[PDB]
Symmetry: D2
Subunit: 474 residues, 4 copies
């Protein structure tokens, strides 16, 4: 019933074509988002380019006032936004409200962090005596139009993590929310417009990525692409962008290296909390357990009982395991489970499917040959791999096509640091589950898990151009 519209040039626009959004919980029609045509995307880019000069000419504090007001409105409407978000991405209702609250906190932190970007005043005298009187005043300037593309699992938090760092830096933002999540992206736009953001400073583009995505990625006006999504689409986007700056937050098959001298109870608690949070539908989540021979059986028992503790059901009952986003994802996860069963994997938990609602599957005795050891199921499946030495554990963790994060569970932290710089990942957590963590911490992946460093400071700095001004002081 409810018509949703895109924020273009500060006013709400509908489109001729439309996409109907169905709840993953029970196929309930939640609304309709506009399927913008190519010319409407051109008009939205026009508006952003026209609004860029006045936005960039504001003070940093005047720019941050809008972000603070947006955060206040998000906090005020957290219940409604979280309810619709829970209905739309099959997220736990209280977890969805928590996502809205963390989004507000991220917007506030980004607003207050973009006020303190300090440049440099370099002297040439340290490099050569001929240049002793040269002073370079190095500062940061907006790249221009930032195109933010968000994934389904966090269409509010991972949209704001691109919008707020871009907006406080002086850029104007073009938001492309995921189709299953476009309602939540348009509610974030609802809040941004209610906060009084100037017309054209923040715009939304809704539509299928398979049809509108390439046009807006290759667009003339886009000066920066901040994309969070699957590796197949991230590779295509980084290949289509060419020379323009990009951030990619792609897939990740994060490992949990459990060593012999590890607190197996804490390790199991952390691994299950990270692995099966939001039905395994976080990309920064333990997707592999690489455990040595000695402690493998005890860790498998503890992991299996912890997975057995998980509640599986409706998002509004705050179930730990909720339905996966759509039927195709469930089919892919089921195919990985079937492959693992084919190759004699010890299923440590019941394997039941009720359509989208898959039950948490813990696999033991996983080898190289099962696709679940490599492919990111992006669902409630956790393979347990047994290795003989720390060298084999590091080798197996590094054979992945992914480098987002990893976690090392051990008591000797000197060995944990050694493994940490031997691991080809962007972040290593010692005795803790992998997570994006405090959003001031750097967040990056390396080997096909991304391209660029993000986190609030790093994303604010990376969506800006350095401009040096060199003059003579004597």
């Amino acid at each position: 019933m409810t018509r949703y519209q895109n924020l273009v040039n500060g006013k709400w626009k509908s489109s001729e074509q439309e996409i109907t959004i169905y709840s993953p919980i029970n196929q309930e029609e939640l609304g309709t988002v506009p399927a913008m045509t190519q010319t409407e995307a051109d008009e939205a880019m026009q508006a952003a380019r026209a609004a860029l000069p006045a936005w960039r000419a504001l003070s940093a504090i005047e720019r941050a006032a809008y972000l603070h007001k947006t955060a206040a409105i998000l906090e005020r409407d957290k219940e409604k936004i979280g309810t619709i978000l829970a209905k739309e991405v099959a997220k736990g209702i209280k977890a969805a409200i928590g996502e809205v609250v963390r989004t507000a906190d991220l917007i506030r932190y980004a607003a207050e962090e973009g006020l303190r970007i300090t440049g440099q005043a370099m002297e040439g005298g340290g490099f050569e005596a001929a240049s002793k009187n040269k002073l370079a005043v190095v500062r940061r300037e907006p790249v221009g139009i930032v195109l933010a593309i968000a994934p389904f699992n966090y269409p509010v938090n991972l949209s704001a993590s691109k919008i707020a760092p871009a907006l406080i830096a002086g850029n104007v933002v073009m938001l492309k929310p995921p189709t299953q999540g476009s309602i939540s992206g348009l509610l974030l736009a609802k809040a941004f417009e209610e906060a009084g953001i100037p017309a054209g400073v923040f715009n939304t583009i809704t539509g299928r990525g398979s049809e509108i995505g390439d046009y807006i990625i290759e667009h003339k006006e886009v000066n920066f692409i901040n994309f969070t999504g699957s590796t197949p689409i991230g590779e295509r986007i980084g290949r289509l962008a060419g020379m323009r700056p990009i951030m990619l937050e792609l897939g990740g098959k994060d490992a949990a290296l459990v060593l012999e001298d590890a607190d197996l109870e804490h390790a199991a608690k952390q691994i299950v909390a990270g692995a099966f949070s939001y039905s395994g539908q976080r990309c920064t989540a333990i997707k592999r357990v690489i455990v040595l021979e000695s402690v493998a059986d005890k860790l498998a028992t503890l992991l299996q009982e912890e997975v057995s503790k998980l509640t599986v059901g409706d998002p509004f009952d705050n179930a730990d395991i909720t339905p996966v986003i759509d039927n195709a994802s469930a089919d892919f996860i089921w195919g990985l489970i079937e492959d693992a069963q084919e190759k004699e994997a010890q299923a440590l938990t019941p394997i039941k499917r009720e359509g989208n609602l898959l039950w948490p599957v813990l696999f033991d005795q996983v080898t190289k040959d099962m696709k679940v050891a490599w492919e990111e199921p992006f669902g409630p499946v956790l393979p347990i791999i047994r290795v003989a030495s720390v060298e084999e554990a590091i080798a197996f963790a590094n054979e992945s096509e992914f480098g987002l994060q990893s976690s090392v569970f051990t008591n000797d932290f000197k060995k944990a640091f050694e493994i940490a710089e031997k691991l080809e990942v962007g972040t290593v957590h010692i005795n803790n589950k992998t997570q994006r963590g405090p959003d001031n911490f750097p967040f990056l992946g390396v080997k096909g898990s991304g391209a660029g460093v993000q986190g609030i400071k790093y994303s604010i700095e990376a969506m800006t151009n350095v401009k040096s001004i060199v003059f003579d002081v004597k």
Copy 2:
């Protein structure tokens, strides 16, 4: 006569196919460089990948010792290297020796700057109280194999500006010197090998870029591409690299905005020194003069007499204007001159050509329609454009397809700063000619003049991966 070989795995290798290098001065055969096949490039990448672990496992100071020894050997052999460099790229002999000396100084500065890369120790308590006990130890780690590709005009200095920042960071370097300049790149390799660099840490790939370039750009092992060259090739490289990190230092049509309240004598001296240094064959050089109506005639007179002061002839006579690199470049520059003459441009200096040896041409009354106003001639041609206001000057400077650098000549520095952040360039020089400057200063271009920030600190940092290690301090 003289056979030259590529440094592969610490030993010198020749190839079946060969490229003969002819002096641009008089078509003198200077030697032969190997035209490496695809499998030889594979072997060189193999060697770099194998040598990466031991190189990265060294101390920063042990790594910098090799760079200091290389700089000492370069200083020792500056006369021979500069003589062959002057013969090979038709550079002034004393200017070539100066390039070798600046290369040694750059290697020393990069070696001493990579010793001081300090990480961060971040706390989560400022973002959220739940994470008050989290500590992220953020540091830098090598990307891996850095593929450096150099242009002809500075095959030693712009090779070392990619090698030394990469080597001190812990990366291994694959050098692709330009074919007209490969001899000088192999002499830089000569010095690097004599300094005792470990086998496989620094390798060279010689051959035509049109045939070996795409293979090594798209190679499996290359973890970073540092390319300096023309914009057409830089766009292709940034498009072929896809998701891998790149630096591009592409073309630049730098402008010299001369305002009414400017020191026209100093402005003219600086503009001619920057524009016609090395026959206009520097990319960071004044290629446009955008001068207001009031001072245009006086500036044109001063510029024309300064260009008339220039000596045109042999590189070993230290002529200000030397032969351009090859016949194709001379033909392109001549075509631009012919277009300007077609469209009624006031040639302020004699227009004579003796093959590669073109004479400095100063054009006045240049409009939008002449290709010399837009295309980078990369030669001894300097168009003078007249505009009516500062707004038109800024608009015309920003209409270019390039954003490397610009210089603003005026006496009111407050207006100079205003213009400086209105200019869509990477660096603005106030009352000075554009230059790469002290190599600690940031050097970047924006609008198709590059992708990334370079300069010794920035290039050291940008050829490294961030690695965060997060643990509990409780």
Copy 3:
């Protein structure tokens, strides 16, 4: 009538001895502040030392929540606080309310700036190969108890500029507001307590500095002294503190170097705005005009007419020139004026006194021998000095016993930068009046104008101890 009490250990305490506060405007009794005894100061230090562990154990964000709430309460009560502040330091009422608003903004900025203090993770491999496997995790930790002592002219803003950077860093603060200004300091404490600051985290000590000041400066518990005041007291405090860390923001005789190629109208506007703001009772204010021979007459004419534009009267009429703080300050300023008149200084403006209410005096033809050329009058007097060259201008600016700030007025900014690093000051303003500026900018003096670098980032960092943790 109104009894005021000190915030000690989160509860309000009165003292046996008392100080009565009289309005500099009309000697109106504004209230009474407690004259704390030595043992009461000991008890307050006890409370701060006891509250330090729990305060330091909070998150930075939990600590900043209290500062944000304090800023909100200050914004809410700006009218009342500014009214009492205007009555108490004879500041313009709208200027006083503006001071309260800037105080709230400073508290907010310090709270949000102390959340982002990031340490370092250093490696030993760049220094020596033997230490390639050593990692130093360098971070910041509170010094402990910070003793903040404020001057009269900004008893709210210059109190918060020491409290908020100290509180967000994890320190507990002992505030000593000026006696003429202690009411405003206790209103700032009123707001800090209403915001819910934990008991003992923020305490106030009221009393005469001449009697309680040395005891609390030399106290056992004080781990840091942040003092803003006159140079004679700052020298004594830096000498009594001994080895403990200190910040001093002492006197400053800031100069306005006006060169020949200068915009004399803009220069005169800026010089008069800086020099006679709050009756010259700001320490970061133009107190000297050093102008070359060529433009001296034009600059003197423009300066004299700008000073003639100034309104002199009641603070609640928002007069540009208000009564000076007390009779002793007026006597000192009058003595400097009398010396200048003795030595044949061209008084360019009327010289009238109505007790505390002095009228803005612009002096020309000032030489070395007049005390107004050197001594900080801290009042509405602006000497104009004429020099023959830029070298003499720089020399005369550097002969001062002060190094707070200076301003260079010229059109050639390359020459302005040259003069700027030839000037022995902490900050040089080019074509602008001297000011503390945006409180993120560094603020320091050098040659007896202070000791240390302040400004929100620098004050947050300088009230903390570095702690390195080195492991393999």
Copy 4:
């Protein structure tokens, strides 16, 4: 026999009064240093003040060239300087040569670190919108004349650690070497003058600190006091300096907190290596062992055998334990030993004295009441204290009048970090002996162990004044 002279105004000056230097080894006359009068100190300050402008007007790289030449000359003359240093402070000959080598390396690192001091370019727009157009160019400028005062144990290394960071920053240095060590300070001056340092840039003041020290501390010209010495003199200096900036590196009674889950063999090796290096005559050395009840006996046995391994004798035989500096120090250490024996301390090693040559004494069962538990013996005595809990260990470590450094020996590094921020010291070493470490690491003490942060970067920055230049960018 050999007359030594002070470097004043670039030329060598003798004094009427003289101090004879006697070797602590065998009371051998090593030479005579001038006992400068007050007027000679005035003349030296005059020379420094006169040479300050030209020194400060040099390029940073021109300033660093002199430091590099000084380091080269020190490396060249390391054998002679180390021989005289070993004779003069009774240091091991090979240890003394190692000190000279580390001094050269410190001078080189400080020279290359002072070239890279980069300022800031701050904008007012983040604080208030009214100041959006203000730019502060914040940089560092020399304080002026730096008065460096060195202690006896490292009269070369701890002199250069004040001279090189001061000289590279643009300051001129007034060196006051210790009387027992003034010969080595004048040899460091020998090298500085041979390197060609400009006249008056580096001067030396020799004489008794008890007579010339207060005059030069309270001097008019001294703009900064960098003092390393005992706490009684440091308190006096910080009290006499008043408002002028100071660094103090005072005494330190560093503790070695050994917990139950600790590697007692490694802990004992590290504790004995730190505690008895140079006869306990380093200030950053383990002077207390605070060990829990459980592992106290095993740690005491291991410590006692490690101390029994130590060789006691002549410095030129490279003995681990060498004679203490003078008879008064030996008497003080003997008094502390006698007090410990009085109060029933278990002397775990032989207690023998041959004048200055004391033998390493390891005390067990040490309580609060023995002066050796609190007073810094500054000699070959190591008390072992037993405590019941970690809380008592932290309390006893914090009851000291000193806060230089401490070391925590344990296997659980999370507990080690917890103790580390509970310890009221400047540096905590985890599973390692305390040391000044790599001289890039910060070095500071807190509770009467100093005032200020030192280490090469921190000492370079702290001997400079911040200067902000604020202008309008429009």
